[PDB]
Amino acid sequence: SETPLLDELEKGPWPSFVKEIKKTAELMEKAAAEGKDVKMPKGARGLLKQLEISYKDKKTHWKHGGIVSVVGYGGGVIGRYSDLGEQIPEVEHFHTMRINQPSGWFYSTKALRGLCDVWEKWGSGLTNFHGSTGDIIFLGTRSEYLQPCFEDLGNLEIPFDIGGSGSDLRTPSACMGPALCEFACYDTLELCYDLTMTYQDELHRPMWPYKFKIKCAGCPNDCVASKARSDFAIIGTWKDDIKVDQEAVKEYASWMDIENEVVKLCPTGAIKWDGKELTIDNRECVRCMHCINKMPKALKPGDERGATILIGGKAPFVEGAVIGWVAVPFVEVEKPYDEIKEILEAIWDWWDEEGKFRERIGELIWRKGMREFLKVIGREADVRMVKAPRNNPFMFFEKDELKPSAYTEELKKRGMW
Amino acid sequence: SETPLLDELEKGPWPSFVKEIKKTAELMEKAAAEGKDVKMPKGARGLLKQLEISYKDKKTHWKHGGIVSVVGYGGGVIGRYSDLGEQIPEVEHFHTMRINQPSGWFYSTKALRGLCDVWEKWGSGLTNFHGSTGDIIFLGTRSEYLQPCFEDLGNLEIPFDIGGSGSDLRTPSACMGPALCEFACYDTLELCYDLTMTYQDELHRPMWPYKFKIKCAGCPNDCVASKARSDFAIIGTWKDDIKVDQEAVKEYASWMDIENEVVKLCPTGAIKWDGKELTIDNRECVRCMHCINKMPKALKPGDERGATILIGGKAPFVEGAVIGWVAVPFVEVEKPYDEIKEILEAIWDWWDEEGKFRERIGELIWRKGMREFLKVIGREADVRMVKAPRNNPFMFFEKDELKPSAYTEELKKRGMW
Amino acid sequence: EGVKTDFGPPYFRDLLHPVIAKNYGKWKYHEVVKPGVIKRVAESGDVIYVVRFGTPRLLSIYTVRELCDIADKYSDGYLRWTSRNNVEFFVTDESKIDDLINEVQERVGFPCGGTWDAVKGEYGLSNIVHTQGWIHCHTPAIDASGIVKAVMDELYEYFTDHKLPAMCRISLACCANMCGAVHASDIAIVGIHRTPPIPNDEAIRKTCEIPSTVAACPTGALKPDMKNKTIKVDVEKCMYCGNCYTMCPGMPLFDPENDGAAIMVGGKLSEARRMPELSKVVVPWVPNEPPRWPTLVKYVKQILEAWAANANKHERLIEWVDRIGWERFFELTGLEFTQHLIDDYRITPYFYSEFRASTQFKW
Amino acid sequence: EGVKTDFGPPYFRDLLHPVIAKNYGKWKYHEVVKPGVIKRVAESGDVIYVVRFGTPRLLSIYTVRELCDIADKYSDGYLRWTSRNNVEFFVTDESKIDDLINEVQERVGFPCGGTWDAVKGEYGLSNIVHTQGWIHCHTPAIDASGIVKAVMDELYEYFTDHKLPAMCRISLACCANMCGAVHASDIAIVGIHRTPPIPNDEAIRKTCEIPSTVAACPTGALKPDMKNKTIKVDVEKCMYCGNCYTMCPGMPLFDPENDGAAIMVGGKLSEARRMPELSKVVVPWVPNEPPRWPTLVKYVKQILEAWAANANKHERLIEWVDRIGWERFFELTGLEFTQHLIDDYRITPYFYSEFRASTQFKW
Numbered sequence A, B: 001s002e003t004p005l006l007d008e009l010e011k012g013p014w015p016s017f018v019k020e021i022k023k024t025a026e027l028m029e030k031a032a033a034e035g036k037d038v039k040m041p042k043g044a045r046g047l048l049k050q051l052e053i054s055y056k057d058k059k060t061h062w063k064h065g066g067i068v069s070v071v072g073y074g075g076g077v078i079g080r081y082s083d084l085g086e087q088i089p090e091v092e093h094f095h096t097m098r099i100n101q102p103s104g105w106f107y108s109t110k111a112l113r114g115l116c117d118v119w120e121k122w123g124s125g126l127t128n129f130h131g132s133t134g135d136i137i138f139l140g141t142r143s144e145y146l147q148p149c150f151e152d153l154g155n156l157e158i159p160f161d162i163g164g165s166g167s168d169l170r171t172p173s174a175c176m177g178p179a180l181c182e183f184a185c186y187d188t189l190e191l192c193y194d195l196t197m198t199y200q201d202e203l204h205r206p207m208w209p210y211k212f213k214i215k216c217a218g219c220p221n222d223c224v225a226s227k228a229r230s231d232f233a234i235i236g237t238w239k240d241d242i243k244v245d246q247e248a249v250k251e252y253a254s255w256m257d258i259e260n261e262v263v264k265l266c267p268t269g270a271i272k273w274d275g276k277e278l279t280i281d282n283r284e285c286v287r288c289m290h291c292i293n294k295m296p297k298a299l300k301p302g303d304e305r306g307a308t309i310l311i312g313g314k315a316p317f318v319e320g321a322v323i324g325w326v327a328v329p330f331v332e333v334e335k336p337y338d339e340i341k342e343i344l345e346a347i348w349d350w351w352d353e354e355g356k357f358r359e360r361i362g363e364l365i366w367r368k369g370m371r372e373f374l375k376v377i378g379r380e381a382d383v384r385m386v387k388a389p390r391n392n393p394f395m396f397f398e399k400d401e402l403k404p405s406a407y408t409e410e411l412k413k414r415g416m417w
Numbered sequence C, D: 001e002g003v004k005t006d007f008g009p010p011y012f013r014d015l016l017h018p019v020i021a022k023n024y025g026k027w028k029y030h031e032v033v034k035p036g037v038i039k040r041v042a043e044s045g046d047v048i049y050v051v052r053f054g055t056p057r058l059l060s061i062y063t064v065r066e067l068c069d070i071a072d073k074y075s076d077g078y079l080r081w082t083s084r085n086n087v088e089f090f091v092t093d094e095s096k097i098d099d100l101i102n103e104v105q106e107r108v109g110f111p112c113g114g115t116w117d118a119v120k121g122e123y124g125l126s127n128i129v130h131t132q133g134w135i136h137c138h139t140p141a142i143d144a145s146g147i148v149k150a151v152m153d154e155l156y157e158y159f160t161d162h163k164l165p166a167m168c169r170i171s172l173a174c175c176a177n178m179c180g181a182v183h184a185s186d187i188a189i190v191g192i193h194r195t196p197p198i199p200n201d202e203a204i205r206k207t208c209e210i211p212s213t214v215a216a217c218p219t220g221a222l223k224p225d226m227k228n229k230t231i232k233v234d235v236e237k238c239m240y241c242g243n244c245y246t247m248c249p250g251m252p253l254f255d256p257e258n259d260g261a262a263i264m265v266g267g268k269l270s271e272a273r274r275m276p277e278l279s280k281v282v283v284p285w286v287p288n289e290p291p292r293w294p295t296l297v298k299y300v301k302q303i304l305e306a307w308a309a310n311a312n313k314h315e316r317l318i319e320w321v322d323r324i325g326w327e328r329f330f331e332l333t334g335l336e337f338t339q340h341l342i343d344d345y346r347i348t349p350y351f352y353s354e355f356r357a358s359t360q361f362k363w
């Protein structure tokens, strides 16, 4: 019994990853014994064994990796080395390839079979579907294989490029939006592709002070956790009236307790039902989506659609975890998305000039302040950016806001202006 | 007029501070003209003239003061010097003396006449009733008069001591409490008095990193604004059931909209009214006072009374304005108040040992952490101290909480333990 | 023998009205009879009337003596001040209440009022807590007394009657030190500077302890200049708080053209209905324009009238905003939101927002 | 020629099911049929059946190939993955639905479920988002995939049915880098250390950029020792965040015996009914106990079950807590409050608490 601690986790109703690992080693070895062109048939068992030692030791056995990648790109390959390199020769190198996903993780079978064939030949046969940011994760290969593998991907009939890693634009992602969802306020899949295509260089060749992530949600339910895990969350919204089919509300009202399950749950009391007539005061509505989620056969988003842009979303390091905040209350999402692109490009120009090494955009805005950030993107301050006005009087004033005075002339005279 | 700008503020219905200043000037000058023993008859007129020039220039005419005091004290008199000393010699030195008020600002006429007689002899005749901390302000005298003025104050039939200033315990203040108020949960005035007398030395002789202020409120209405303007806010509370006179509730119900003005306004929905019986779920009550405030003939605070201690209250500088936060959910308030005095003395010993120049207690607690603070006052962490548990995993652990290990042995071996 | 010291204030029990001393901690209920008049009923059956009047806080000793004559005539030689600097008399004979009111009004010109009544749900505007301004302080950006007077002349009717639907405190801080609960008022007027200090190197050398002057700056805009034994200011980091001049005479930053007041709103101290709250800037600046400050007084009235016209019974300004939102607040008050109002005071820790700054919690 | 680069992902439009392509951006309503099956009705009156299954996230290519066989047999050569790593099939014929479900179980061993229905108000438990752990990352405090295996074995029954009165997300991160949506999830498991780094001076000289390592420490616990040419760590300032080890191979802080997980609760992403919220720590530390992590699993279940028992329809954990308060949260979930849970992360600015971290505002 090679793997007594891991074996235990092949028991149970939930789909065993251990079984995924063991199924790969078995079928890779069986193939290389058949003369199949399999470069790393030992890799998957190599991993099985290393992870067991990890279970015993209750610690990782991966050490810091040297920087490695493909020719022409600086990101998308993450190097990883096993400190058990001698005992398990076939995991000394075991790098990750991040492979750019189709918007919304939509796939035809062809697409997948082609991915499967390349990785069988050059890799461990292990994958992640999908990585957190969105990319497909080809899990575990060697340095000499990175370049041949990528050339094969690029030569597939359905070709896949490498996703983003490092101080770059990471692979953007999007909820299903209009492919399947009736709540979609803009074509999330198209925007996500257009952005991916538009900034291929910013993605493939890291040049920035840190990483920068974009996610695209169809509506305020935010099905790709864009406000928590991207620096720039493009979330669908609308500006006009929720559309209401009154007899559809009636069919709902025959069996659903709308008073308790809908009216009382609306966070601003905008929505009313009297047994006859559903009324929404769209001036009080904050588009939380609840009533629409409740009654999708009867209630729809307004027709004046676009998105709100939340800025700053990130994990804790260094200055604290961030759910992004209102940067642009409303923006059109219309191909070729020049207004969005204009925003992104100005932030990047500014971030690259002013940012410290490993400063996230959210941390730059906290350091420099919103007046500077708003200037950069060419937008005015708006009450909707804050939950409350400042709780202290310590305001900066632009020098052009001051009344000319003997004092201001003294500042000018000394060059403190 | 010599005072055309200030003369404008003799018009209008609100009683005028300009008339107070001019009344003083006229009558001090007449007193002196009558041969009364008045040391500074021109003081109030000087102040008026200075202020008129200040109204014209839109700036103060006072500069940083000398350090001045009465013999035996280092606090309670604030030097103030005019930049117009040559044009207006009579305000060249114009210091204030803070005079400790009786608890809750209760006076007899004899007490007040003794104060007027002494200030008429030794200073300008202007006063403030009262300074924001609570003290009577004797507004404006000279260095040579401070000691003889204090000697007279101490020789009065009802004598008055100097209050605090500088880096000392300031004069404590108290709401009227049980002298007039049926909501009072402890004897605010008695506590206030006792603290003042217990810590006379701390008050008269500044020895600390900065100021420390105590205020005593009889219940959560906080009518002395303790939580915003004292470091140590002692706020009345109770632990048992709100007392309900059901018949009196029915009387209020005959005219008052209890449902809208009481039931609906309870922060926790603890109180219900069905037209015949008032019900308070006391496990849900958070003792906000609202229902009692609304129905004072029917509802009263419970019998198990004490105080909640709020720590940290202060104006902005340096690290931000503070409304005090929960340090002690409950402490009994019973003469000679040993439990309160124990907490105070522990805090002061720690703050004096660890505090930086001009660091307030709330700032120190921000710097050293709640854990250290709680250890100093010998209390355990309590969920009532927070609005929410921490939003990040960056927790300090005590070395005795760790499991013994090879690693902890390595830390010991190196003296990192 | 030596001069007496460390004797403390007179003991308050000796200065209480006999009826108050007798019924101390033994009250049944209070009842607000009319603006300025609260009836207090003791368990013994004693009844006392506490009659409240507005004062200009600064008093002539001659006023205090007039108030003494009055308290001897109507209040048995007893009186108190309140925590907002109103003055109260104690009347046992209800038929004398109106005689007292009229005599105070005639002799010293102080108005009866400053009260409110939660039971009926009708509120007076009480006195403005304020401080020294140009009368005595060396660090003010604005006057205190002149503004309080100009504001109360305009809102006087709200002091003498119970016209407001909820409690509204107005408070004034002549500089960012506050000296008061100004940071937690429904409407706060706060003196501010808008210009940086200009180091006076000679005065700094002679009189300023440099490392502590430097450590007083919240933004780190000050550095020591060791070469010249003085201090340098990075003007790009300074927000004109004034704290370096508190520390050091060689750091003045007053400009009479650019000093003025910010207007903040939405503070709350009491727990009733809703937790306490720090006030928030809604008007960045208004100039000093003595003696009447018309621009300042105009905005204070505009904000108070908008809240008063739209608030439900008991709904204080911050509670009104809880209901409607700041978007509608800015609209209904006719105020502009600008980037100045977006908070950037970096030093304050977020963890303070997670602490319970309130006595509200469950046992 | 060289080699094709800068070409990007294949185009999504070409990878859509024919019925999905046809009706793109033109749907009427969806309708949750039974757990795991969503009906989707086009405006064009076309009908489509989205059938969801759970995955281990980690997948053999041969499993992917087996899936592809399934996809060709039931789903016209198409499928997708969800933003939580479930896999989805597109059934045009409703009679072939249960067959697909039995064949997926039969071949690849994946469960049908992970769906919820706000309409009835009955929610399933969806897949747990997680990272690499000891499978691939060099900075994990915990495993990911094993703890996920563990938990979902306990709570399996919640995936395949709609057993919950609101949406509850479980998320895991193997270290404080918090590599998913862990920081805003209803229940979150975060790998933590409790021991400081022991500097390895050799490895620092050879392989570390001192100034950047030093500046990476959130608490300033690190100082260059230029003697010596290494880094010093003030242990009183260090809170075991691991960040310095991300920067430098010479700063490990791994103690197999003190490394473990914190449990945080009450994070929320959607706007529905209540603003988004960051997760809060409610259990400071539980140990690694491969293979099943009994204690961790116990506390998670304890918290889920306790909340499920008391929560109203749509009432998510943070909404529960908004209603009952933290005092009551701790009593009902049977957990201890300790000083560990009082926030002391100094660097985060208070002004963040005043920014709108939400799309909810009024026009």
Ligand code: SRM
Residues within 6 Å of the ligand: A078, A079, A080, A096, A098, A128, A130, A131, A132, A133, A134, A135, A136, A137, A163, A164, A211, A213, A228, A229, A230, A313, A314, A315, A316, A317, A318, A360, D130, D131, D132, D136, D137, D138, D139, D177, D178, D179, D180, D181, D246
């Ligand atoms: C591959 C992936 C884990 C997974 O299997 O899901 C991953 C794994 C790593 N992340 Fe990440 N992150 C992954 C998505 C995320 C996300 C979620 C997202 O992107 O949607 C976050 C939170 C959002 C954010 O960026 O803040 C995330 C936040 C981080 C953090 C902290 C960032 C911060 O500013 O606080 C670290 C630190 C760093 O970047 O230096 C990090 C860095 C790392 C490193 C490079 C480890 C390190 O210390 O250098 C990881 C390598 C593991 C390996 O060798 O395989 N990763 N990481 C995730 C990406 C797969 C993909 O490409 O699609």
Ligand code: SRM
Residues within 6 Å of the ligand: B104, B174, B175, B176, B177, B180, B181, B182, B183, B221, B222, B223, B224, B225, B293, B294, B296, C030, C032, C038, C081, C082, C083, C084, C085, C086, C114, C115, C116, C117, C118, C119, C126, C127, C167, C169, C181, C184, C185, C267, C268, C269, C270, C271, C272, C314
């Ligand atoms: C006399 C005085 C205390 C003193 O020792 O001097 C006082 C006395 C009373 N307070 Fe107060 N409060 C006094 C300052 C305060 C202050 C402190 C301040 O403003 O600096 C506040 C905290 C302000 C805040 O919340 O921001 C204060 C917040 C209250 C509350 C809360 C009102 C609310 O709706 O939130 C009540 C309840 C009520 O309205 O009945 C109150 C109620 C009362 C009651 C009714 C209690 C009682 O049972 O007698 C007293 C009569 C007030 C009235 O006019 O209805 N007292 N009260 C204070 C007079 C100030 C003045 O001249 O106007």
Ligand code: SRM
Residues within 6 Å of the ligand: B078, B079, B080, B096, B098, B128, B130, B131, B132, B133, B134, B135, B136, B163, B164, B171, B211, B213, B228, B229, B230, B313, B314, B315, B316, B317, B318, B360, C130, C131, C132, C136, C137, C138, C139, C177, C178, C179, C180, C181, C246
């Ligand atoms: C006299 C009094 C104003 C008044 O007319 O009511 C007063 C007046 C001064 N205050 Fe104060 N403060 C007065 C109560 C307060 C209060 C409220 C309280 O005590 O209830 C506060 C807010 C609570 C607090 O202390 O934080 C207050 C917060 C300050 C601050 C800022 C402290 C901070 O941590 O931010 C300063 C700054 C300093 O201490 O150097 C200060 C400093 C000063 C100075 C000494 C001026 C300065 O910049 O160095 C004032 C003297 C003016 C003069 O010479 O006439 N004063 N000051 C108040 C005390 C009189 C009395 O004994 O009753």
Ligand code: SRM
Residues within 6 Å of the ligand: A104, A174, A175, A176, A177, A180, A181, A182, A183, A221, A222, A223, A224, A225, A293, A294, A296, D030, D032, D038, D081, D082, D083, D084, D085, D086, D114, D115, D116, D117, D118, D119, D126, D127, D167, D169, D181, D184, D185, D186, D267, D268, D269, D270, D271, D272, D314
């Ligand atoms: C399939 C998927 C989209 C995608 O893959 O691109 C999806 C799809 C839908 N989501 Fe979502 N959401 C998906 C991830 C999410 C996640 C993101 C996450 O968990 O990381 C959440 C945000 C989580 C949060 O708020 O913390 C999410 C928040 C919602 C809300 C939340 C309900 C609430 O009370 O807050 C709605 C409303 C609802 O319940 O109908 C929603 C509703 C929906 C609807 C019903 C919308 C529609 O009109 O079809 C979609 C059907 C799902 C269902 O089970 O009813 N979706 N949705 C997502 C993957 C789900 C999975 O279980 O594998």
Ligand code: SF4
Residues within 6 Å of the ligand: A175, A176, A177, A178, A181, A182, A183, A184, A185, A217, A218, A219, A220, A221, A222, A223, A224
């Ligand atoms: S975010 Fe909106 S559009 Fe996108 S899947 Fe979720 S609910 Fe549909």
Ligand code: SF4
Residues within 6 Å of the ligand: A265, A266, A267, A268, A269, A270, A271, A280, A284, A285, A286, A287, A288, A289, A290, A291, A292, D273
């Ligand atoms: S969307 Fe939300 S806020 Fe708007 S009406 Fe519906 S429930 Fe209310």
Ligand code: SF4
Residues within 6 Å of the ligand: B175, B176, B177, B178, B181, B182, B183, B184, B185, B217, B218, B219, B220, B221, B222, B223, B224
């Ligand atoms: S704080 Fe409480 S006890 Fe004191 S006066 Fe106000 S209501 Fe009465």
Ligand code: SF4
Residues within 6 Å of the ligand: B265, B266, B267, B268, B269, B270, B271, B280, B284, B285, B286, B287, B288, B289, B290, B291, B292, C273
């Ligand atoms: S005291 Fe406040 S919380 Fe308690 S029942 Fe009365 S209103 Fe509700």
Ligand code: SF4
Residues within 6 Å of the ligand: C131, C132, C133, C137, C138, C139, C140, C141, C173, C174, C175, C176, C177, C178, C179
């Ligand atoms: S608020 Fe400022 S100006 Fe007014 S007294 Fe206090 S320190 Fe002086």
Ligand code: SF4
Residues within 6 Å of the ligand: C196, C197, C216, C217, C218, C219, C220, C221, C222, C233, C237, C238, C239, C240, C241, C242, C243, C244, C245, C253
């Ligand atoms: S005024 Fe304030 S911010 Fe400006 S330098 Fe002085 S202390 Fe610093």
Ligand code: SF4
Residues within 6 Å of the ligand: D131, D132, D133, D137, D138, D139, D140, D141, D173, D174, D175, D176, D177, D178, D179
């Ligand atoms: S969370 Fe930490 S351990 Fe997990 S993958 Fe990300 S960096 Fe590695």
Ligand code: SF4
Residues within 6 Å of the ligand: D196, D197, D216, D217, D218, D219, D220, D221, D222, D233, D237, D238, D239, D240, D241, D242, D243, D244, D245, D253
């Ligand atoms: S572990 Fe974190 S806190 Fe400790 S030294 Fe390293 S970075 Fe600093």
Ligand SMILES: [C-]#N
Residues within 6 Å of the ligand: none
């Ligand atoms: C990288 N995350």
Ligand SMILES: [C-]#N
Residues within 6 Å of the ligand: B133, B164, B165, B170, B171, B213
């Ligand atoms: C305080 N004085």
Ligand SMILES: [C-]#N
Residues within 6 Å of the ligand: none
């Ligand atoms: C403070 N004075």
